[PDB]
Each structure stands twice: as structure tokens, then as C-alpha cells.
Design an enzyme around this catalytic site. Structure first.
Site, short mmCIF file in Angstrom:
data_model
loop_
_atom_site.label_atom_id
_atom_site.label_comp_id
_atom_site.label_asym_id
_atom_site.label_seq_id
_atom_site.Cartn_x
_atom_site.Cartn_y
_atom_site.Cartn_z
N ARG A 1 0.82 10.15 40.47
CA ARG A 1 0.34 8.98 41.18
C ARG A 1 -1.14 8.80 40.86
O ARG A 1 -1.83 9.76 40.50
CB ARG A 1 0.58 9.13 42.68
CG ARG A 1 2.06 9.29 43.04
CD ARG A 1 2.23 9.80 44.46
NE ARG A 1 1.84 11.20 44.57
CZ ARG A 1 1.77 11.88 45.71
NH1 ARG A 1 2.08 11.29 46.86
NH2 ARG A 1 1.40 13.16 45.70
N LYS B 1 0.76 15.02 51.54
CA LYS B 1 1.54 14.72 52.73
C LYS B 1 3.04 14.66 52.45
O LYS B 1 3.84 15.19 53.22
CB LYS B 1 1.11 13.39 53.37
CG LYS B 1 -0.26 13.40 53.99
CD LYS B 1 -0.60 12.01 54.57
CE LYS B 1 -0.96 11.00 53.52
NZ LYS B 1 -1.44 9.75 54.17
N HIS C 1 1.48 3.57 41.80
CA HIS C 1 2.70 4.25 41.41
C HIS C 1 3.34 3.66 40.14
O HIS C 1 4.26 4.26 39.61
CB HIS C 1 3.74 4.22 42.56
CG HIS C 1 3.45 5.19 43.67
ND1 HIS C 1 2.26 5.19 44.36
CD2 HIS C 1 4.21 6.17 44.22
CE1 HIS C 1 2.29 6.15 45.28
NE2 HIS C 1 3.46 6.75 45.22
N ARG D 1 3.57 6.12 37.27
CA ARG D 1 4.56 7.15 37.62
C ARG D 1 5.98 6.61 37.41
O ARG D 1 6.81 7.27 36.79
CB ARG D 1 4.39 7.62 39.08
CG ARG D 1 5.69 8.10 39.75
CD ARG D 1 5.46 8.74 41.14
NE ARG D 1 4.99 10.09 40.93
CZ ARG D 1 5.24 11.14 41.70
NH1 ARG D 1 5.96 11.07 42.82
NH2 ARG D 1 4.72 12.29 41.33
N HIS E 1 9.21 15.59 44.03
CA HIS E 1 10.14 15.07 45.04
C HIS E 1 10.84 16.20 45.76
O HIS E 1 11.36 17.10 45.12
CB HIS E 1 11.20 14.16 44.40
CG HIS E 1 10.69 12.81 43.99
ND1 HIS E 1 11.36 12.00 43.10
CD2 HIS E 1 9.57 12.14 44.35
CE1 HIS E 1 10.68 10.88 42.94
NE2 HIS E 1 9.59 10.94 43.68
N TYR F 1 15.82 6.36 39.70
CA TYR F 1 15.71 6.22 38.23
C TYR F 1 17.02 6.50 37.50
O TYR F 1 17.09 6.36 36.28
CB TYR F 1 14.63 7.15 37.68
CG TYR F 1 13.30 7.02 38.38
CD1 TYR F 1 12.52 5.89 38.22
CD2 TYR F 1 12.83 8.04 39.20
CE1 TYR F 1 11.29 5.76 38.87
CE2 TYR F 1 11.60 7.93 39.85
CZ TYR F 1 10.85 6.78 39.68
OH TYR F 1 9.63 6.66 40.32
#
Lengths: 167, 165
Positions: free
Chosen positions: B33, B56, B108, B111, B134, B143
């Protein structure tokens, strides 16, 4: 729990008749024992096996000409009238002494899926093949997929370089 | 999800300069990112491996890069790799190149580009999940539809390799 290549060889050597044919079909498609055992000739179309609705949605899985030939030629109606599951189960249990109770119906399916991933298969494709409604179901096989982080270099849209030229 | 095509990547890199262009290249190479790429320091790049720390909502992970990318981004041997980053200019430039970019997604877009092209190019979605940080594959499955279609994999990859053994 799954059968290694060595265990598969031993299993196919100890089975016979329709039992051996069902085993080959499950190892080729990920079929549960039951859906393989109740296959009919009308369910094989152009070397593609349809597992009809039960409770599961219908799904289709390709097989080779060799497999289709072995299980379906010159046969009409149910393909495996001489299936013998208890005999299959006893043979399976001899080969795999640590097989938990009742999982003889799924061991060959687990074997299919495990080797599929070891061999370089996509978890997305395996989901479709197995008929899983959620990817979380298929993820029980995910740890069998090798992870090569340097794929980030070779497969990125710059092919690992710093430059992108236009048309 | 909106990603940049190969043509758009070429237009973007030609329009960017300085630290912004370096960050873009790094994101296109790693799936980073914008924010986590832009705050990288010298200590996060060790022997052609970039470490993205825990945030986070994403896992910590280390992503390999080519020597050429490392050489481009490792001038500063101490402190921030990209102290002259300018997100507002980067964002403007990106939006001119890709006008249908949903609001907020300039952070993003590269990415998504990494990830989409990774899948088009035959990459494993399980490896991609790890690379992106992830926590659940469900996040990466956005994706999945870019993966190549092989209708006969059940034959080629089953333990009998399509035979009757």
C-alpha cells in the site's frame, strides 16, 4: 489424512472389479465414494463426469479417455453394479491402519485434493472441482501448496525490473 | 477492483518523478500500500528483502525484490528511504491516468495492480495472500477471477496423472 503415491499403488493392486474402478475414478476426480458408486453411463459426456444433484449441487469433472474407457464403455445404466464398499473399506484399512472410523468414503477424495495441491494445483480450481460452496472448506488443503515468495519478483507487472515501456 | 493495465503503468511511471516514482515502482513490485511503502526506512530493507511491519488490518511480511529495485531504493543508508514523497501529487497524477478510479483508492491502486497481474501471470493465490499480508484468503479472492483458465487440471494434476496407473 491421505494416501501417498506408495499407498495408492498398494490400494489399486489389492482392489478388484468395480471397487478398483471406483477407486480410480475417485482418485481422478475427488469424488466421494457414494457419488462415484452411483454413477450412470448417461452421466459421462465427452469425457466429463457429471455428479448429479442430491445434498449437493450438480458439478462436472473431466476425466481422461483412458479412464472413461475403463469405467463406461459398453455399459448402460449404473456403471458399478458390483460395488462392494465394506470390502473396499477393509482393504483400505489394511493399507492405512491409522484411518479414522468411517472416513473410508472420503480418503480417496482427500488423496485427490492433497496431491492436486502438492502437484501445483490452484486452490480456486480445487474448490470448483470438489464442489465446495466456500473457499474456507478447501483451505484445509492449502498448507500443501508450496509458497515461493520470489514469485513477487518474477510475476510482478515489471517482471522484476524498474521500467515499463509503452506500446 | 480497479487495477492499472500494463499501458497505464507505463504512462504512470513516465509521469511520476523522484521519490514518488520510486515508491510506485516499489508498490508495483511488492503489492505494498502507498502508506507502508512511503514510511519505509533503511532498516526495513536487508539483502533484497523488504519488511512491511504489522498494521491495524494487515499482517507483517517480508517481500523479496530484485537487485535492480533494491539498488534504486537503497540510497539512504539511514532514516527514511523516501523523505520527499508527495502523496497529493502522486494521487493527482494517478487520477489523470485512471479517471474511473474510485474515491480514496490511490493508496491501493498499485497494490491491486501488483495482485491482478500476479494472478494473470500464473501466480498462486495462496502465495499472494502471504505477500499482501491478508489474514484471510477471502480478502485475496477478489483477484481470483484473473487466474488463467485450465479446464483439464483435474486430469493433469490428479495422483494418477490422467492414467489408470
Amino acid at each position: 489424512g491421505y494416501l501417498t503415491q506408495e499407498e495408492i499403488a498398494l490400494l489399486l493392486a489389492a482392489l478388484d472389479g468395480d471397487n478398483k474402478k471406483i477407486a480410480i475414478l475417485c482418485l481422478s476426480t475427488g469424488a466421494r465414494w457414494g457419488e462415484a458408486a452411483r454413477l450412470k453411463a448417461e452421466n459421462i459426456i465427452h469425457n466429463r463426469v457429471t455428479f448429479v444433484k442430491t445434498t449437493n449441487k450438480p458439478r462436472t469433472v473431466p476425466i481422461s479417455e483412458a479412464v472413461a474407457k475403463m469405467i463406461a464403455d459398453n455399459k448402460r445404466g449404473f456403471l458399478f453394479p458390483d460395488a462392494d464398499y465394506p470390502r473396499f473399506r477393509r482393504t483400505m484399512k489394511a493399507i492405512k491402519p491409522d484411518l479414522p472410523m468411517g472416513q473410508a468414503t472420503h480418503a480417496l477424495r482427500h488423496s485427490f485434493a492433497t496431491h492436486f495441491m502438492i502437484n501445483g494445483g490452484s486452490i480456486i480450481t480445487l474448490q470448483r472441482i470438489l464442489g465446495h460452496t466456500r473457499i474456507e472448506q478447501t483451505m484445509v488443503y492449502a498448507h500443501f501448496a508450496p509458497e515461493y515468495l520470489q514469485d513477487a519478483i518474477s510475476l510482478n507487472p515489471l517482471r522484476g525490473g524498474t521500467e515499463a515501456e509503452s506500446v
